[PDB]
């Protein structure tokens, strides 16, 4: 379905007064500092040595390009010494880069700590997806995980968006950030909140909190729009995965460098020198996203008059 | 035509913190208590022994599933001893369940009392449908019926919806509830108020009054939306009737149990433990329903910010 | 689609016939019927409800004088209670044509029992390989049909449910002893565009077996579809849907009215075509176009003969 | 549709004709007409209003020199007042061709009276079985037409209203004595896709009766449709709609202008085709495509002859 | 539409040709051209502006080595100033092929003067009956062309503007003395669906006159349309639009680049088809479908020969 | 499109076959395969990743018993590291059929080295003129193939990537020594509607070389497309997409499940058609319609034989 980003139009800047070389795309995720506003979301894969090499290549490219790498689920690697090697390799090959651990919301605090130590993670992603998994204690388990692990915890919603009330609960539980991954199955055909509306809604209530948008971002323009809506960083999988399988590490690195240059180009045209400036770039929200936000009490005009 | 329910989108709840087994779907219709928020609307049928057996089977399934049964029109059974047997059977086969009598708005207070006694009814449905019947004294006749019968009276509008002014008049006349059954014929091609708009409109003026939605509800999601818009109970015919004719009583019972479990599933995902909670579930109204309600002075944002 | 929309009768300007002269009687093999339309009952959900529906359908069929094909009798063979729901059809309709109904897995003994259960005048054996493969084992179907035809004392109608029937299949069935064929008109995606339309099947089969009995049932929307199926060679047509709907809505009286209405609508069409009898309707000039025309042309079936006759 | 959009004239690059040399005179049987287009009046609502409309149409027809076919004279036969509304046509147009008009239920006596009422040069007998069956009894229509043709003293034109005419129907009518046929181009749903288009009827009939008179009326939108109908074999074409509209909007002067304009537009088309006379237009090379082409091919009518002539 | 989208070349998997071996030279009657594409200049608005445009087109044509057909010289015949805008074409392009241009109303004296004005190698005479009838008098056009062909000292190309050309028209023109025909591809509504497409005209004419020169101009969008027209039998093709656009946008340099590019794109298509010369492209196997296929089939033109050659 | 949607199997009502009797073994020239479907691996991005993907595909192919065609070995010929990614296929699958793969620019020495690298049972030589002309030099391709066939010790399969193959091209390849042909199904705009569909290529080639080996790969969406390609004459079919997707998503176990599933789905289709063996499926009656039917008719390929067989 749609991310809602097509309902966003930046206000054209005629005199950006900026050179492409002055553009700084460094950003922050909670207390972490990243040289890139885009990170790689690896897939869990089918395991075996193939997943091992895919992870090793993703880690090598991430290390060379200087972008963060979020591994696929470590739930099975926690009890499988062999699969564990396919995660440890990421840190061995990328000793100085940002790497995010990954477990589901069912994980215990002890599992969370183990997943973080396995790859010397700088952050931990915890995934939520009630709709697909169809409960009680989920928030409490997340609170304990945030308490027990020292690194920032990023709670990710898969496929249905996230409301401001849900983000508020996660932030109160201790989450450093939320990641909007924007016969019974029919009930959810038109269910959820789009990525664009989720970002605007959450930002209206928690202006200084960290939000990440992942999944569904097709190109640098979508990345730019998610950042303008409030995201501090964005995740991408498919495009990078395809580049790796089709052109190897060299191809993936090229694709990574490409999208980063395209984002800087867009920022240049908008006269946005830094990520902070892009997060304040004037834009107009229309269509379904506009209607949703208006009914939800979120001010849309402030995006256009800022 | 459309019920308008597609113009309703629940706000996704990421952390419902609820187990399917904690969900309570019991509700109330005026002073009556029902273990189910869904009831069966029988059709008048062609009479004869076929209607007798259909009614007997509907009554048996209703009794076993614990859901209420509203019989088809009793107008002809009032003067036909033979057809009378096809209604008396419902109470004989379902001694302890909720059964609703049914007559048209032309019925007299004496007919109303007779229809109620015929099946030991717990409530009486009185149907309105001026558009199809093309008058004076209709409301007065309904007032007398409400005065003369002790059981709660449910006034049902067939096909064109019901405005808040119309519901107000019915409540003042003594009705315990309203049921939104959402060359001259051409004039009414785009006539009426949708089920969604009727429910929202009536609820805005009579927040504590009983409303029922019947007809046009396709599945548990529609049932959930009508309840969120204010309905205390919902009626269904077609789907149950088809199940009976195609798979007998056992099939009907299965279909009944199925839709109830699907409603609980939706409630679970929304974090709504009870019907009262579902009636307060945050949602966004859009499209034609939104426009209609806005012009009619009904606050739509309160549904989204609640 | 049935493919009948690809059929267009050649307009007759001087039909020279009064509605009152129209005779719609027909023959199904050696069986004589006063109506070219019969009722296809559904198996239903069993119980007293199916019993009353079957009783009403039998009553209506008896009064309207049209044939009645019951739903599958497979379960009634071992269920005493369900059996009563089929026997009632013959008790309520002692003089009308009634067709028994079993699947191709039936044995000759089961076939005789189904016929005896309702004093049947003919027996339908249904074939539905594709539907069964989706929901296995098709070996012996023709053998079973052959054993059935030589052992029952009534004509056997072999019915294809949903995917049409080729002239080769019809030939194997007639050769095996069938008195007539009835064109009922994930892994399931494989069969989305599978099959032969009712219109193409009738034309194909008739081209090879001009004197053989064919029936079309399923998908016939109104009297015009009935007229077209007969013009393509069918001796009788079956309908279920709107007949059962009329019953549940307006009872026996409604069903009877609906049956009388479609029969009068057919006579009206025949009047406009100048077709005084079913035999004349079976020779009414018409033009075949579209998908049906292409299909028959590729299969070697002459289409222009329908238009020049 | 008339099916005329399925007809495409073969472009002539060197027509070698000046508009002034174009002759649009034609013949309808033994009748000679200076125009290949005639006015089809409507029966109207009676009273003095229909009288004045008929008078104006007769005036315009007389001045433009084109034929006039009156509306149904059935009621005027027994209504003295209505009769005046038809007699006025001949009083106002003493020298032009005027066609009388009755339905197929008419007797020979009624036919003679209708002809005498307006000093008619020909008589139209309308056939509309389908429309009458919707709104019964069609036996004897051909017999009545046969009795009429042998007893009236003028040529009879048998007109099919709305569903086209087959070559078999035309043959029965010519055999009965008709001088020409005129292709007028719930239970009612049965006839939504019923009939033969004007284009297919003209081609079918002409293939069997190359020397017989055919007329096309109804549905002709402009001079190009007129040209096409003639190229398919029609000797004359009729129009009602826009002529009556021009009358009510701009009176007699407007009607006269509209008639002169379409006649000049036809001459223009003939000029571009290099067709100096109606007989040449009737042999103008053209290609038939689509539904019309398929229909004629299935019916055994040669279509390529139109393109190679 | 030109109908060229109804043409599909049969893919050759082993063309066995290097782009460098491709020869695109062709012949137009006895005239030899190094290019199968020529420039069709427009008459323009006169004045010094048309003069410079013509000078630039002549310069580009001379350098690229392709033929140039000037705009209508009718007014330049009596206007001394306009005449300079045509003479400049031969001064600027002394060795290239240049075609003169007049309408079919031209006399033999005017034709000789137009040829002499630019030292023309051939003369185009345009026919546009329909466009002139909309905006009269077509008698004598063939006579004038016949007088012109026997009196000018160069080959005459008769061009049909917009409605295509039939094989009968082409035969009359060749019989009259034309060296080639050029298929240029209210009352105006009559001609909305009028004519023969470029593709059908080429195929029709070639079927009757296999050895005769045909040219296609107008409507050719790119090198693929050019390749297709040649495969259908054209010896040369003309283009105006994008060439004039390239001139006004990027001057002479741009026009020259655009001409070189389309010629290389044609060689590319020929390379993939294994067609080493224009003569080979004229025999390249292809399949004709759709409206064009139907048209030719009805007109008796063999279409399968194109696919089996 | 592959054109396979233009193919419709004639429904068999009495298949008389149990799924267990279905034999899907086939032959590719002298090579015997237990499966009519093989895996087409992609060249990949090299490195250890391509190595593991190739190892997994070889493992799955060995266990499922189906053939494996590797990606282009051109670079592995000079790159020692890449070479290991191909040798691993034979180490992991010692007994299965494996096809080597090089482009048409390959020499006989390179062909022998590619075969030896993986102990290949056959060698694929790919032809893709159009794709190379977009991204030059095609002379000598047939000569190179001819040199390769006489010097390698295994059968050579010549594959056309994307634009289909004509019967003339196939004849040149078989004449040159190829054991089979494989139908892989700005200036780039010229080829938007270019080519012969997979369905038309198979039918064309089979009409001229009934006993020759054809393979179809690319564009086959599911088991029904596989069944259709075989019915049109293919002995084996190749797939890449969903197999590689299953591997990356669910590893070797997932790939193996996906292969087993499509093979069972094919057996299901064959069961419903009454086709007990691949040879029977290759003779299954079917009707060809649409674009494919038109193409073959124009090319002189009999289409009705498929429907009457």
Swiss-Prot record, chains C, D, E, F:
Q: Report if keyword Nucleotide-binding is assigned.
A: no
Swiss-Prot/TrEMBL keywords: Cytoplasm, Flavoprotein, FMN, Isomerase, Isoprene biosynthesis, Magnesium, Metal-binding, NADP
UniProt entry tagged with the keyword Repeat: no
* EC number(s) stated in the UniProt entry for this protein: 5.3.3.2
What are the coiled-coil residue ranges?
Answer: none
Where found in the cell? Cytoplasm
Ligand binding (Mg(2+)): 132
Q: Which InterPro entries match?
A: Aldolase_TIM, FMN-dep_DH, IPdP_isomerase
Q: What is its main location?
A: cytoplasm
GO biological processes: isoprenoid biosynthetic process
What reaction gets catalysed by this protein?
A: isopentenyl diphosphate = dimethylallyl diphosphate
Q: Enumerate the residues binding substrate.
A: 131
A GO term, aspect molecular function: magnesium ion binding
- Name the PANTHER family on file: ISOPENTENYL-DIPHOSPHATE DELTA-ISOMERASE
Q: Which family does it belong to?
A: Belongs to the IPP isomerase type 2 family.
What quaternary structure, including any partners, is listed in this protein's UniProt entry? Homooctamer. Dimer of tetramers.
State the name under which the record lists this protein: Isopentenyl-diphosphate delta-isomerase
């Amino acid at each position: 379905r749609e991310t809602g980003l097509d309902d966003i139009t930046f206000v054209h800047v005629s005199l950006p007064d900026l050179a492409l070389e002055q553009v700084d795309i460094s950003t922050k995720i909670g207390e972490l500092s990243s040289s890139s506003p885009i990170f790689i979301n690896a897939m869990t894969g089918g395991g075996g040595k193939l997943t091992y090499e895919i992870n090793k290549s993703l880690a090598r490219a991430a290390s060379q390009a200087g972008i963060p790498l979020a591994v696929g689920s470590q739930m099975s690697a926690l009890k499988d010494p062999s699969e564990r090697l396919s995660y440890e390799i990421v840190r061995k090959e990328n000793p100085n880069g940002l790497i995010f651990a990954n477990l589901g919301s069912e994980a215990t605090a002890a599992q969370a700590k183990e997943a973080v130590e396995m790859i010397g993670a700088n952050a931990l992603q915890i995934h939520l997806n009630v709709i697909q998994e169809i409960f009680s204690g989920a928030l409490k388990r997340i609170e304990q995980i945030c308490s027990r692990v020292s690194v920032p915890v990023i709670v990710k919603e898969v496929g249905f968006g996230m409301s401001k009330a849900s983000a508020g609960k996660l932030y109160e539980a201790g989450a450093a950030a939320v990641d909007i991954g924007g016969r019974q199955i029919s009930f959810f055909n038109s269910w959820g909140i789009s990525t664009a509306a989720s970002l605007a809604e959450i930002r209206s209530e928690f202006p200084a909190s960290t939000m990440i948008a992942s999944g569904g971002l097709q190109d640098a323009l979508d990345v730019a729009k998610a950042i303008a809506l409030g995201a501090s960083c964005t995740g991408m999988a498919g495009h990078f995965l395809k580049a790796l399988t089709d052109s190897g590490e060299e191809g993936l690195l090229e694709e990574i460098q490409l999208i980063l240059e395209e984002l800087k180009l867009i920022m240049t045209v908008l006269g946005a020198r830094t990520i902070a400036d892009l997060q304040k770039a004037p834009l107009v929200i229309k269509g379904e996203t506009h209607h949703w936000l208006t009914e939800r009490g979120v001010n849309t005009s402030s995006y256009s008059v800022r």
